[PDB]
Amino acid sequence: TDIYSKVLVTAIYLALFVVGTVGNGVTLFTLARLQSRVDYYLGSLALSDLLILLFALPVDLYNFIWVHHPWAFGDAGCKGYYFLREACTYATALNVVSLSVELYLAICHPFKAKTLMSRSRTKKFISAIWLASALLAIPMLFTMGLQNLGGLVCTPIVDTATLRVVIQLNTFMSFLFPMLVASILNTVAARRLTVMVHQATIEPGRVQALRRGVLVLRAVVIAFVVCWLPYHVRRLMFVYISDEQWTTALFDFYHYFYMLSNALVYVSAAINPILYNLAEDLVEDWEKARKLLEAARKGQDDEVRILLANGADVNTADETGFTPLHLAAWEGHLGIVEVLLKNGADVNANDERGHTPLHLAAYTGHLEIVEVLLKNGAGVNATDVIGTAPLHLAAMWGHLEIVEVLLKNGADVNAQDKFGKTPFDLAIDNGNEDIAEVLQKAATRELEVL
Ligand SMILES: COc1cccc(OC)c1-c1cc(C(=O)N[C@@H](CC(C)C)C(=O)O)nn1-c1ccnc2cc(Cl)ccc12
Numbered sequence: 001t002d003i004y005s006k007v008l009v010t011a012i013y014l015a016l017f018v019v020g021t022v023g024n025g026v027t028l029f030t031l032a033r034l035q036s037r038v039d040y041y042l043g044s045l046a047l048s049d050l051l052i053l054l055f056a057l058p059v060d061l062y063n064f065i066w067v068h069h070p071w072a073f074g075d076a077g078c079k080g081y082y083f084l085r086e087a088c089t090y091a092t093a094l095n096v097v098s099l100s101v102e103l104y105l106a107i108c109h110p111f112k113a114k115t116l117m118s119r120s121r122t123k124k125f126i127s128a129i130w131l132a133s134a135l136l137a138i139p140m141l142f143t144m145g146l147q148n149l150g151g152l153v154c155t156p157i158v159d160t161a162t163l164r165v166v167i168q169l170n171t172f173m174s175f176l177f178p179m180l181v182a183s184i185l186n187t188v189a190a191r192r193l194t195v196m197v198h199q200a201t202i203e204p205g206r207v208q209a210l211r212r213g214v215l216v217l218r219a220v221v222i223a224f225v226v227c228w229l230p231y232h233v234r235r236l237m238f239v240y241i242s243d244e245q246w247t248t249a250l251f252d253f254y255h256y257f258y259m260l261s262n263a264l265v266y267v268s269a270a271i272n273p274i275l276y277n278l279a280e281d282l283v284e285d286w287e288k289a290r291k292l293l294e295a296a297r298k299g300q301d302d303e304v305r306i307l308l309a310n311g312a313d314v315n316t317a318d319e320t321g322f323t324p325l326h327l328a329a330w331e332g333h334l335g336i337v338e339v340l341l342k343n344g345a346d347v348n349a350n351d352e353r354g355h356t357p358l359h360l361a362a363y364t365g366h367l368e369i370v371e372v373l374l375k376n377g378a379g380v381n382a383t384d385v386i387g388t389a390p391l392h393l394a395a396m397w398g399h400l401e402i403v404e405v406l407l408k409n410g411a412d413v414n415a416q417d418k419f420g421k422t423p424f425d426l427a428i429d430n431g432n433e434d435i436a437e438v439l440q441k442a443a444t445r446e447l448e449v450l
Pocket of ligand 1: 063064065067068153155167235238239251254255256258259
């Protein structure tokens with residue numbers, strides 16, 4: 001009797017329909033063309049959420065919101081509707097949990113993630129989820145059916161006791177237990193993730209990727225719970241409210257509660273593509289980073305420029321804490337080092353061992369890179385865990401030209417390490433007598449000031 005309510009809902013239903021159908025459609029079309037196991041889950045969700053908007057929404061809108069009396073889809077359409085709706089609630093829920101499980105494993109079992117996780121395994125698993133959802137939905141073919149009360153309505157055809165149990169079961173199996181598992185695992189994953197963040201002078205890329213996964217998956221569960229709790233609460237209310245005590249106050253309440261509860265289920269399907277965006281955006285950033293470290297190590301000068309331009313993180317590191325700049329200098333790719341520092345690479349970055357790019361540049365003995373790094377404000381007197389300054393390494397491996405370069409930029413010749421050895425001492429040890437003379441005079445000059 002409140003027509004505005006129905007009209008307002010129609011607008012929102014159509015809005016969620018037209019966009020949500022197109023959104024999930026495009027997501028499936030896009031995916032059709034290592035971590036391609038993510039895509040399978042996002043494809044699984046897209047499919048489940050598409051089917052709800054395409055088949056469930058329009059039937060719901062027509063024969064539950066507007067036209068109450070005559071059921072326009074017959075006995076098959078009645079049974080099918082409730083089957084395909086329940087199948088898709090299960091699939092979506094089970095997929096969302098599988099997602100939080102895969103993240104949890106990736107975080108809390110890195111060793112297992114490498115071995116256990118495989119494309120073939122995921123394909124077989126997703127097939128089981130859909131099949132599990134389909135089997136658990138069969139009861140809806142027998143529990144729901146047409147009744148005449150012209151007066152043809154898609155109402156339960158079993159006794160309330162039976163109906164209360166099948167739905168009570170579905171609510172546990174396709175929400176409560178799923179969300180329980182998910183929420184817990186995500187919290188355990190969040191607790192475990194903060195351990196690995198505490199290890200940080202490294203800043204690993206894989207950690208940063210997982211860090212984001214937790215944030216995305218936190219949103220997915222909070223989003224799923226708020227969207228699906230009202231729906232499940234209403235269906236539980238309906239089974240226990242099946243007595244003919246329907247006061248006009250209860251009618252009014254349920255009328256709006258039905259509209260709102262179902263609208264949020266369609267919202268949950270219409271936001272599904274946003275998750276795809278958040279996932280692909282996260283995975284692409286992770287992929288760009290790996291490629292940047294690979295290209296920097298490899299020396300693919302052309303690739304580096306591309307990656308940086310598209311938005312690859314210049315200050316990424318591997319498990320050990322080596323940034324692309326670190327590797328570029330180590331492999332002696334002057335052209336790359338110049339590009340990285342141009343795009344804003346951290347000149348004073350350290351690995352686990354405490355080695356700045358300048359350490360590795362001195363070790364190898366690439367004069368041109370050293371001069372570049374120092375121009376960009378490198379730490380001349382930067383020491384590692386052993387206590388080795390770059391001059392120590394330059395002197396030890398006999399790079400007299402680098403030794404002169406460093407001292408020019410204000411290198412401390414008097415610096416010592418854990419073994420107490422100065423660069424001059426390391427030159428004498430290694431037998432770089434020519435370099436030692438340069439350091440010998442350097443120390444004597446400083447004494448003259450005092
Ligand atoms: C058009 O719907 C009916 C027509 C005649 C009799 C009816 O109830 C016996 C129903 C019916 C069914 C439902 C309902 O919520 N059904 C559940 C069934 C499940 C518990 C299995 C669902 O689809 O989630 N709700 N529901 C409704 C009853 C009364 N007012 C309603 C107002 C609206 Cl806007 C929607 C459904 C209503």
